[PDB]
Amino acid sequence: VVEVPQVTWEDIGGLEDVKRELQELVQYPVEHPDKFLKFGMTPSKGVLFYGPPGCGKTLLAKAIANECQANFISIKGPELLTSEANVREIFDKARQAAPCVLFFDELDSIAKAADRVINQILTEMDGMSTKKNVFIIGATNRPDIIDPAILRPGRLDQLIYIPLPDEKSRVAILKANLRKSPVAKDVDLEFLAKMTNGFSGADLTEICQRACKLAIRESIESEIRREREPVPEIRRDHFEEAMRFARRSVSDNDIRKYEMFAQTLQ
């Protein structure tokens, strides 16, 4: 299915550096078209996100579409295998869907025949002007194996690091995930942030989902009882139980590799 996504910049905790750089990447061509003439800038054709898994790459690709009132078409790495006109049939359906975001997910896998399902993507890329109104976003957890041809000028213009959330970003992920839940006043997410060092956004969302299931499973069983003879809330004790089921999903060793990779490019 092809639609305009529903997630907004507001559903994303942290990453505010990336957020304002993404906005001006798409807002500048349309808010000052009258200065993109004078000096002769050809607008951005694409970006590439890299970093640990479950830290917001897919959400910023949807949020970019929601901001541009664009359709979103999401194709996932291994399903490109049967088979080269696949790379031409998804591109035509995105051209058909303009204005559109084409999202290439999980193809660190492709980076190890498969040889030129890459080159068919690079040739499809170079043969699609900015005038078609398609914006390509790619994502990977293996930044050590990008073939640097996809980042040559004319293709995926920028490479952006989407890292594990620091203490201040965990408070914002928790707040953004519960923005529309009735959470009890005794709940302190600042304290929940200090206790979740190394947790990804995915991990933080899970903890939010378990406390939610408990607070309403408790709701059904109680007035099922108090009918034998007013909104309920998620409380501090629902979050306590929900944390026995809680530990990180990204290892310390792989956290060092990402930190080494991002840091060497300043």
Ligand X SMILES: N#CCC(=O)Nc1ccc(Cl)cc1
Q: Which stretch binds ligand ADP (CB under 6 A): 48-56, 123-131, 148-156, 233-241?
A: 48-56
Residue from the set 143, 163, 165, 201 that interacts with ligand X by CB under 6 A = 143
Cβ–Cβ under 8 Å, residues 111 and 79: no
Nearer to Na ion, 58 or 71 (CB): 58
At position 127, the amino acid (one-letter code) is: G
- Residue 258 found at the interface with ligand X (CB under 6 A): yes
At position 167, the amino acid (one-letter code) is: E
Q: Which stretch binds ligand X (CB under 6 A): 7-15, 18-26, 235-243, 250-258?
A: 250-258
Residue from the set 43, 53, 77, 99 that interacts with Na ion by CB under 5 A = 53
User: Pattern 114-153, binding to Na ion, x per CB under 5 A?
Assistant: ---------------------------x------------
Structure tokens at 252: 């310390």
Nearer to ligand X, 5 or 201 (CB): 201
Q: Rounded distance, CA 63 to CA 69, Å?
A: 10
Nearer to ligand ADP, 14 or 46 (CB): 14
Residue 5 interacts with, from Na ion, ligand X, ligand ADP, none (CB under 5-8 Å by kind): none
Measured CA to CA in angstroms, residue 217 lies from 23, 48, 183, 213 at distances of: 41, 41, 15, 6
SS (H, E, C) 61-110: HHHHHHHCCCEEEEEEHHHHCCCCHHHHHHHHHHHHCCCEEEEEECCCCC
Q: Please report how close the Cβ of residue 49 comes to Na ion at its closest, in angstroms.
A: 10
Length, in residues, of the chain: 266
One-character DSSP codes across 238-261 = HHHHHHHT---SS-HHHHHHHHHH
Three-state DSSP at 160 gives strand
Q: Please report how close the Cβ of residue 227 comes to ligand X at its closest, in angstroms.
A: 54
Structure tokens at 74: 């999401």
Q: Which stretch binds ligand X (CB under 6 A): 6-14, 94-102, 231-239, 255-263?
A: 255-263
Q: Rounded distance, CA 68 to CA 190, Å?
A: 33
**Binding footprint of ligand X on the chain (CB under 6 A):** 142-144, 254, 257-258, 261
**Binding footprint of ligand ADP on the chain (CB under 6 A):** 12-15, 53-59, 139, 173, 176-177, 201-202, 205
